[PDB]
Design a protein around this nucleic acid. Structure first.
Ligand SMILES: [Mg+2]
Ligand SMILES: [Mg+2]
Ligand SMILES: [Mg+2]
Ligand SMILES: [Mg+2]
Ligand SMILES: [Mg+2]
Ligand SMILES: [Mg+2]
Ligand SMILES: [Mg+2]
Ligand SMILES: [Mg+2]
Ligand SMILES: [Mg+2]
Lengths: 171, 51, 183, 147, 48, 114
RNA sequence: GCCCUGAAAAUGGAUGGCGCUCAAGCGUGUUACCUAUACUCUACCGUCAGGGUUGAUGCCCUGACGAGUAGGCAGG
RNA sequence: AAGCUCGUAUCAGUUUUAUGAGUGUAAGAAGUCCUUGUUUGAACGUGGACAUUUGAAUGAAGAGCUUUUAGUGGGCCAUUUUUGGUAAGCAGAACUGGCGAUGCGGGAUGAACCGAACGUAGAGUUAAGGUGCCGGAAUACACGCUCAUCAGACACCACAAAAGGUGUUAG
RNA sequence: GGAAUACUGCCAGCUGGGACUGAGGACUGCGACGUAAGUCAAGGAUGCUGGCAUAAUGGUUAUAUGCCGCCCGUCUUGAAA
């Protein structure tokens, strides 16, 4: 669906002589909190030796974009599950929000790489402060000063089956 | 002879629950809470904003 | 519960709320082609036809049954308003092995008065707070016969997990929206 | 579709009615149906059930068996009730004075009881005398002894 | 079979007094009986 | 390590009949060399009774009823104690219950991002 | 990742047909919509079950069910 | 199908706990206490007594024992375990489903595919599959990819050597 | 620093439009509004009005249209094959 970002903080169950186990936080992109918690347990078991049965979720909070009406460039570092192994991929996405950039990235992985949400891992989404660190041409072409472009061949949606006039594509 | 849903029939609702009259009169379905000025800790804010 | 969460954040801590003590379960798949062990567990939870629902007290003994019948149910944590609307609209009692509608407080007093339950609101209380007589109250309630959801299931394919875009399994708090659509 | 946990349309049975076409037997069944419904007495329940039994399940009760039942302590003045036929027995030489209620008496059995000094009464006479079956003793004859 | 860890007792052994004996012991006795019978047959061929 | 008739044993090898590994049965026959074991096996819709003969080192005394015996003793003792000192006691086992609320402190335990 | 080649016989024929090219193709996401003898509610038939009742193998009240070959029982 | 019983009786294609194995067994009247009798100890007893807080969860109104006879018993397909294999198909075991006796919706059509099992109707809502037209239902919205001198809309098996290409896109 | 709004949830909040159904047949019950006598949407539809009064509604029959429907019985897994 449309993505939200959550911080999920969990821990092992306290035992005898071991109070206050270490708290682990993870940033998860998901459609809702049930999916977010599921992905968190998946990664915690994949990385450490912690199971959902032996642990608990301490906190889960939605994280909002700080400046959702500011256009930013994002470097996205991902890796996808494969027979040859984990494969790094770096992409650049221009958008106003991290969740919008991640939604674009998932749609793009489905379109080009034929990849699914369960197969894609997000390693890091970072905002590029300076425009000189942008290094993909399909993003750098939109960083030109006084950028103006037209939209040739305008196709207007018709509400009726028949039109009494030949259409125009002018804009 | 005929089952009447108390969620739609007010007489049946009042027959089953005498407190529904008090609830409607006091507007307890729209009760306002007292406001407090409790502030979260800076450690919570830093952990929430942390990457 | 709300203020405790506010005080925990103010003191730099985290309030971890108590685990849910009650689930509501709805059978989602039909009676054709069910493996034997899940079929038996569905019968033991009294989900004998599609869109039949029951309340289950959460213990370690019951979580494993839910795990066994996961591909054929949708279940979650019901809210008080969901329980109340279920009991008011589709609440029927098992009296002398017959399905008797709960249209008066006298029927409930005559059948559950030995456990201190005098009215439909007392029954609702005993369900929501999983009390000492939860087993008796819950078995007194006849299994709920829900309709298909009024707006649909929201997915093209029902028989995948709720996490993977389907319908079955634990959907936690979203069971309230689903059951209110089905009620 | 419903996954039935039990068999559908299953009869309880329990021999609801007698299989005879005897008008007098149907009258007695009607009377004890009324009594078993309107008294809540287990005696009337037992009598109503025994009125439905088949012939091979209603074996005769002898006067010697009745006398042996009467020899029990505290039971000398009770009315003996046999839902069936009371037959005579030449192997016994002394018979007490008692009242017997039965569907049928053989001529020898009735003569022996009346000679001893009691009376042979019908089950409706018993119904009037003891509408709850007070001070009675129901006797059943041997089952396995026929084959 | 003498060193086999587990043997299932045949149902034909029921109804007899040989039910309680070890099947390995029964097989050893049968083997020795066959060998001694072979020796007796050799002795008979020798006498002929 | 003496086995008698009616004793309950577990089958454990220290090649054939690999089905009867971890099955539990009842001793019916004890000789100088072997032990007879009664086993209930599922054949169709009805259990069938089988006689197995094992070596001594391939079985051991089973501990299946030990919890039941200890619980019976403890229940009798606790019921007697509650009879002596008039108080309400609970003697049935319970399933493991869901946990209660708690406050988790980040005092020295500041959560770390993976 | 998508595309082309990566072998084919032999009456004229097939993504079911028409046809479709920023698709009416392919991958994915969000909603709306269509309709099974399935699910919910109501009526009616029959069957079973539980009750009540001084034309009584009748009457009344209540609940739940209804696939079916060989075969079985029952009422016509 | 008939009887005798019992009916907090008898249980259960399920979980839990304990205890084995790498799915088995057990969880109370077919009990338990004191009292010291049997060949200082195992194993059986003399006599009394403790309940509706009689020994996990969930469900269940029928259960047990006796008699009592119509029709049928070598089938096909699929899933999961094990052992051996072939140019390749596969072959021997064990357990579990589906079908024959069975209609209905969908997959254009159909033994084993996807939904769902069936009294007679009305109304509402859906499943699977779909919504250019045939045909009920958006020539909907959104991000990308592809132009094939017989594309594709397919079975995820084979052709297939992850081979060939100055097609094109992103790593 | 102080507001607003989205999102999610709740109300025994108010209210407009459409469709199908009207089983039961003296009373008895649980309730509600009233100080009260009474009244009510509370153990299942009544009130008011019009036209027609016969082929008008309906049935039957011959057909037309849309969609569905292979020839039965037997015998063999199975059969249009
Ligand atoms: Mg709709
Ligand atoms: Mg669908
Ligand atoms: Mg049905
Ligand atoms: Mg199409
Ligand atoms: Mg598409
Ligand atoms: Mg159309
Ligand atoms: Mg070829
Ligand atoms: Mg007409
Ligand atoms: Mg046709």
């Amino acid at each position: 669906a449309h993505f939200k970002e959550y911080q999920v903080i969990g821990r092992r169950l306290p035992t005898e002589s071991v109070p206050e186990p270490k708290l682990f936080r993870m940033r998860i992109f998901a459609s809702n909190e049930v999916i977010a918690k599921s992905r968190y347990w998946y990664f915690l078991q994949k990385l450490h030796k912690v199971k959902k049965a032996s642990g608990e979720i301490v906190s889960i909070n939605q994280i909002n974009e700080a400046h959702p009406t500011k256009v930013k460039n994002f470097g996205v570092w991902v890796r996808y599950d494969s027979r040859s192994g984990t494969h790094n991929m770096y992409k650049e996405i221009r958008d106003v929000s991290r969740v919008a950039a991640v939604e674009t990235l998932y749609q793009d992985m489905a379109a080009r790489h034929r990849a699914r949400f369960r197969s894609i891992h997000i390693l890091k989404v970072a905002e590029i402060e300076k425009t000189a660190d942008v290094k993909r041409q399909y993003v750098k072409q939109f960083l030109t000063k006084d950028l103006k472009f037209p939209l040739p061949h305008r196709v207007q949606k018709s509400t009726k089956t028949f039109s009494y006039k030949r259409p125009s594509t002018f804009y | 002879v005929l089952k009447k849903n108390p969620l739609k029939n007010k007489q049946v609702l009042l027959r089953l629950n005498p407190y529904a009259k008090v609830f409607a009169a006091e507007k307890l379905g729209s009760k306002k809470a007292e406001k407090t000025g409790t502030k979260p800790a800076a450690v919570f804010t830093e952990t929430l904003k942390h990457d | 519960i709300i203020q405790a969460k506010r005080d925990a954040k103010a003191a730099g801590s985290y309030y971890v709320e108590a685990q849910h003590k009650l689930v509501f379960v709805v059978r989602i798949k039909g009676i054709n082609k069910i493996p034997p062990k899940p079929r038996k567990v569905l019968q033991l939870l009294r989900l004998t036809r599609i869109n039949s629902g029951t309340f289950v007290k959460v213990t370690k003994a019951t979580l494993e049954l839910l795990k066994l019948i996961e591909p054929y149910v949708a279940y979650g944590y019901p809210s008080y308003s969901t329980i109340r609307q279920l009991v008011y609209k589709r609440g029927f009692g098992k009296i002398n092995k017959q399905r008797v509608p709960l249209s008066d407080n006298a029927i409930i007093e005559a059948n559950l008065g030995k456990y201190g339950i005098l009215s439909i609101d007392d029954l609702i209380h005993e369900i929501i707070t999983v009390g000492p007589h939860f087993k008796q109250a819950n078995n007194f309630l006849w299994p709920f016969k829900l309709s298909n959801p009024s707006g649909g299931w929201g997915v093209p394919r029902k028989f995948k997990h709720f996490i993977q875009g389907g319908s079955f399994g634990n959907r936690e708090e979203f069971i309230n929206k689903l059951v209110k659509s089905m009620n | 579709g419903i996954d039935h946990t039990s068999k559908q349309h299953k009869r309880s049975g329990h021999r609801t009615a007698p299989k005879s076409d005897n008008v007098y037997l149907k009258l007695l069944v009607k009377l004890y149906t009324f009594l078993a419904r309107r008294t809540d007495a287990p005696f009337n329940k037992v009598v109503l059930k025994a009125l439905f039994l088949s012939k091979i399940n209603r074996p005769p009760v002898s006067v010697s068996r009745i006398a042996r039942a009467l020899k029990q302590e505290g039971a000398a003045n009770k009315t003996v009730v046999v839902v069936g036929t009371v037959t005579d027995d030449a192997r016994i030489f002394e018979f007490p004075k008692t009242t017997v209620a039965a569907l049928r008496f053989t001529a020898g059995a009735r003569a022996k009881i009346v000679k001893a000094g009691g009376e042979c009464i019908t089950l409706d006479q018993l119904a009037v005398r003891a509408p709850k079956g007070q001070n009675t003793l129901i006797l059943r004859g041997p089952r396995n002894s026929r084959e | 079979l003498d060193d086999q860890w587990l043997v299932e007792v045949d149902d034909k052994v029921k109804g007899t007094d040989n039910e309680l004996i070890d099947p390995r012991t029964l097989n050893r006795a049968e083997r020795k009986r066959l060998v001694k019978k072979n020796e007796k047959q050799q002795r008979r061929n020798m006498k002929n | 390590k003496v086995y008698k008739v009616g004793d309950i044993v577990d089958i454990k090898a220290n090649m054939p009949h690999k089905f009867y590994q971890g099955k539990t049965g009842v001793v019916y026959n004890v000789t100088k060399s072997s032990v007879g074991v009664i086993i209930n096996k599922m054949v169709g819709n009805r259990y069938l009774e089988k006689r197995l003969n094992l070596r001594v080192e391939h079985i051991k005394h089973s501990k299946c009823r030990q919890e039941f015996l200890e619980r019976v003793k403890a229940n009798a003792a606790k019921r007697a104690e509650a009879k002596a000192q008039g108080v309400a006691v609970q003697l049935k086992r319970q399933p493991a219950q869901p946990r209660e609320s708690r406050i988790v402190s980040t005092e020295g335990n500041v959560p770390q991002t993976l």
